[PDB]
Design an enzyme around this catalytic site. Structure first.
Site, PDB file in Angstrom:
ATOM      1  CG  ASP A  96      -1.977   1.025   1.169  1.00 38.36           C
ATOM      2  OD1 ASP A  96      -1.975   1.863   0.242  1.00 38.36           O
ATOM      3  OD2 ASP A  96      -2.815   0.999   2.089  1.00 38.36           O
ATOM      4  CB  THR A  97       1.765   3.589  -2.783  1.00 39.59           C
ATOM      5  OG1 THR A  97       0.483   3.682  -3.418  1.00 39.59           O
ATOM      6  CG2 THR A  97       2.600   2.534  -3.508  1.00 39.59           C
ATOM      7  N   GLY A  98      -0.443   4.137  -0.300  1.00 43.19           N
ATOM      8  CA  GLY A  98      -1.219   5.166   0.368  1.00 43.19           C
ATOM      9  C   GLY A  98      -1.144   5.101   1.886  1.00 43.19           C
TER      10      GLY A  98
HETATM   11  C1  LIG Z   1      -7.015   6.452   3.321  1.00 41.80           C
HETATM   12  C2  LIG Z   1      -5.521   6.583   3.038  1.00 41.80           C
HETATM   13  C3  LIG Z   1      -5.067   8.018   3.240  1.00 41.80           C
HETATM   14  C4  LIG Z   1      -4.748   5.682   4.034  1.00 41.80           C
HETATM   15  N1  LIG Z   1      -5.272   4.283   4.136  1.00 41.80           N
HETATM   16  C5  LIG Z   1      -4.486   3.354   3.236  1.00 41.80           C
HETATM   17  C6  LIG Z   1      -5.345   2.814   2.059  1.00 41.80           C
HETATM   18  O1  LIG Z   1      -4.555   2.194   1.057  1.00 41.80           O
HETATM   19  C7  LIG Z   1      -6.486   1.838   2.507  1.00 41.80           C
HETATM   20  C8  LIG Z   1      -6.036   0.351   2.803  1.00 41.80           C
HETATM   21  C9  LIG Z   1      -7.207  -0.570   3.236  1.00 41.80           C
HETATM   22  C10 LIG Z   1      -7.625  -1.665   2.416  1.00 41.80           C
HETATM   23  C11 LIG Z   1      -8.718  -2.513   2.813  1.00 41.80           C
HETATM   24  C12 LIG Z   1      -9.390  -2.264   4.050  1.00 41.80           C
HETATM   25  C13 LIG Z   1      -8.982  -1.173   4.881  1.00 41.80           C
HETATM   26  C14 LIG Z   1      -7.893  -0.333   4.479  1.00 41.80           C
HETATM   27  N2  LIG Z   1      -7.536   1.774   1.541  1.00 41.80           N
HETATM   28  C15 LIG Z   1      -8.815   2.253   1.576  1.00 41.80           C
HETATM   29  O2  LIG Z   1      -9.340   2.817   2.605  1.00 41.80           O
HETATM   30  O3  LIG Z   1      -9.528   2.067   0.355  1.00 41.80           O
HETATM   31  C16 LIG Z   1     -10.986   2.104   0.275  1.00 41.80           C
HETATM   32  C17 LIG Z   1     -11.345   2.764  -1.089  1.00 41.80           C
HETATM   33  O4  LIG Z   1     -11.291   1.721  -2.099  1.00 41.80           O
HETATM   34  C18 LIG Z   1     -11.531   0.505  -1.385  1.00 41.80           C
HETATM   35  O5  LIG Z   1     -10.598  -0.557  -1.583  1.00 41.80           O
HETATM   36  C19 LIG Z   1     -10.191  -0.937  -0.263  1.00 41.80           C
HETATM   37  C20 LIG Z   1     -11.320  -0.502   0.690  1.00 41.80           C
HETATM   38  C21 LIG Z   1     -11.712   0.800   0.040  1.00 41.80           C
HETATM   39  S1  LIG Z   1      -5.490   3.640   5.800  1.00 41.80           S
HETATM   40  O6  LIG Z   1      -5.994   2.135   5.715  1.00 41.80           O
HETATM   41  O7  LIG Z   1      -6.596   4.486   6.506  1.00 41.80           O
HETATM   42  C22 LIG Z   1      -3.965   3.727   6.815  1.00 41.80           C
HETATM   43  C23 LIG Z   1      -3.733   4.867   7.648  1.00 41.80           C
HETATM   44  C24 LIG Z   1      -2.542   4.928   8.438  1.00 41.80           C
HETATM   45  C25 LIG Z   1      -1.597   3.856   8.389  1.00 41.80           C
HETATM   46  N3  LIG Z   1      -0.462   3.907   9.134  1.00 41.80           N
HETATM   47  C26 LIG Z   1      -1.833   2.720   7.555  1.00 41.80           C
HETATM   48  C27 LIG Z   1      -3.022   2.661   6.768  1.00 41.80           C
END
Ligand SMILES: CC(C)CN(C[C@@H](O)[C@H](Cc1ccccc1)NC(=O)O[C@H]1CO[C@H]2OCC[C@H]21)S(=O)(=O)c1ccc(N)cc1
Ligand SMILES: [Cl-]
Ligand code: NA
Lengths: 99, 99
Positions: free
Chosen positions: A25-27
């Site tokens: 995860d690059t995000g």
């Molecule tokens: C929202 C971003 C700024 C950051 N997120 C990383 C992100 O890649 C997550 C990673 C992720 C993946 C699955 C479940 C929860 C979190 N993806 C996500 O929320 O995507 C959503 C939108 O498209 C969908 O595909 C996945 C769920 C939906 S995060 O999960 O909140 C996060 C925040 C802080 C840290 N240290 C680690 C991770």
């Protein structure tokens, strides 16, 4: 290797002596893994994203084996819905986004 | 371009003639942007993040430029902490993860 993004970029990693599936995860700023035990000291932390925040345990200097590469970094342990390998570890294996 | 991950992979995007900052996110399935006005009708969608689920507005076939690359696809509008360019659009601009 070169990973296309047609599907979720999942990989198998080795941490704390156990194998786990994780999402590259690059995000993500820091790595987050589902509840498990890890050695050493830790401090509480709150991390947030879509949906709000969750409380996690922060362990530093943890070794993680990913794609044959051994990298060391910080790992947050808590109630995450998916195991996430963040930039903190991705930089150590020289991962880059290209287009 | 080849983007390393020591800092957040932020880029400039253009949607509705407006320039915005967005995060390139391989760990997300769909693109999500903060509240803004988009043309046409929208459909309901629930997405689950690290902190839980939230409701967003799904707009399809929206024209968007990402770091100068033209894309046309689904954009979700909702209370996201930051604008996120996800796999659905990363695949269109030909992005891959490499290491
Ligand atoms: C929202 C971003 C700024 C950051 N997120 C990383 C992100 O890649 C997550 C990673 C992720 C993946 C699955 C479940 C929860 C979190 N993806 C996500 O929320 O995507 C959503 C939108 O498209 C969908 O595909 C996945 C769920 C939906 S995060 O999960 O909140 C996060 C925040 C802080 C840290 N240290 C680690 C991770
Ligand atoms: Cl609704
Ligand atoms: Na430690």
């Amino acid at each position: 290797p070169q990973i296309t993004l047609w599907k979720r970029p999942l990989v198998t990693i080795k941490i704390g002596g156990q194998l786990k599936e994780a999402l590259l995860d690059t995000g993500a700023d820091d790595t987050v893994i589902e509840e498990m035990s890890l050695p050493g000291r830790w401090k509480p932390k709150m991390i947030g994203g879509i949906g709000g925040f969750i409380k996690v345990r922060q362990y530093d200097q943890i070794i993680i084996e990913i794609a044959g590469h051994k990298a060391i970094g910080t790992v947050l342990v808590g109630p995450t819905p998916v195991n996430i390998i963040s930039r903190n570890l991705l930089t150590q294996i020289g991962a880059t986004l290209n287009f």
